[PDB]
Symmetry: D2
Amino acid sequence: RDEAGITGTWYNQLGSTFIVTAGADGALTGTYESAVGNAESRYVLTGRYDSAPATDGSGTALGWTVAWKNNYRNAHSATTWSGQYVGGAEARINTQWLLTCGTTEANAWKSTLVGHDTFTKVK
Amino acid sequence: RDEAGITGTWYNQLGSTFIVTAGADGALTGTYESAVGNAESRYVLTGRYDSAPATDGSGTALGWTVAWKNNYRNAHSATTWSGQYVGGAEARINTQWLLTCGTTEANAWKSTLVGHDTFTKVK
Amino acid sequence: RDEAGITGTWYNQLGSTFIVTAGADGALTGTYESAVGNAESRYVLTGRYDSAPATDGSGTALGWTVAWKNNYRNAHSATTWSGQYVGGAEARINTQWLLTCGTTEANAWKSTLVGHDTFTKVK
Amino acid sequence: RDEAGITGTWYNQLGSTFIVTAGADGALTGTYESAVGNAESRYVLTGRYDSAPATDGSGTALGWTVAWKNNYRNAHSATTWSGQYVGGAEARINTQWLLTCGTTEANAWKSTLVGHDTFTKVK
């Protein structure tokens, strides 16, 4: 259980901030602030993590979603990050993400961006 | 707002069942039962959707996460679906997903599956 | 060996045409015409396929790339499709694709679209 | 045109070697040796790149495919890398990839791995 390991403030390579609380059940709840894109200030995030990982040195699977609507902006889109928390002295959250925009069925073929974010506790 | 449109029971092409409640804020909460993989019975899911989409015929962006641990099994993994709800008489949720397994850093390059699921209200 | 199975003209769900010749070695060469996007007429494609698949009913892995430059347009981008050929009476090529645009390092986080195309011999 | 920029030997974060020749037309041809997975020695690769990129500081889109069959092994699979070449003193090829295995239609939902590789001229 990496409840304490995961809970807190994280930073990615683009300068975004991810603030999360991990529940004893597997819940993730928090806020995301993006350094890039059609976004300003904090956005709600919710997700899930494996609260009883293997003890064989494997990482801890986790994922979360941000819908890019808050009181300031609505970018009609949602990103999900899927990845794993790895602990120890250079602790990291390594993810791949999918960002889907709401589109017309005509433009659905260009609705989805794919990328990868590495989060750390420092920067 | 597709709060009522989204809320309810959905089925995908593999025979999985997705049961969700959409909140007025943008919350998604529910259960997922997979027809395939290292899974049995219901798993908690949580996510987010755009509660005020464009009115120009575009779909409604949304996403959610399942961590594949419940009282019966723990597959040390998590899937996130990112997509859009499209309403009208053949209503669909069209998604792409990322499934990450917890791995050793040696095997991280083979940690993540990518696929696509279409959900409908019928089948 | 699905050299003859693969060689010929294929159509996807968006109305694109994929014309390919499969070599005895594993080569794929041909042309792609996209029904959507910043594209007109034929574009060169090249790729690879598994020329000696398993005989246990598994599909045949394959992939190919189009750079979206020809004599008519240059969209400064490239799509790769990765997938498998499945034979028999409703023969299909099932793929997922990544389309990368050339970008500034500032915009690299939004350089890559992900999707899925199903090709058939008819439509 | 980054024909000379691209042509040569490249190394990724996993210790793989990518040896490529870029043609004046847009062709890529070469060999790939993987440091990980069900692979040994060199595998043919073929692909495409944008031979006349924008001059506005954007990268050069490119992609290529390896089918994992050679004289030593056949892993019934194919990887495609889609990405962009960025020049200058720390020159990089930044990619995302899809690796599809041939599967039964029953197991198609778990056929495809997604990842990201950064290649450099040194290491």
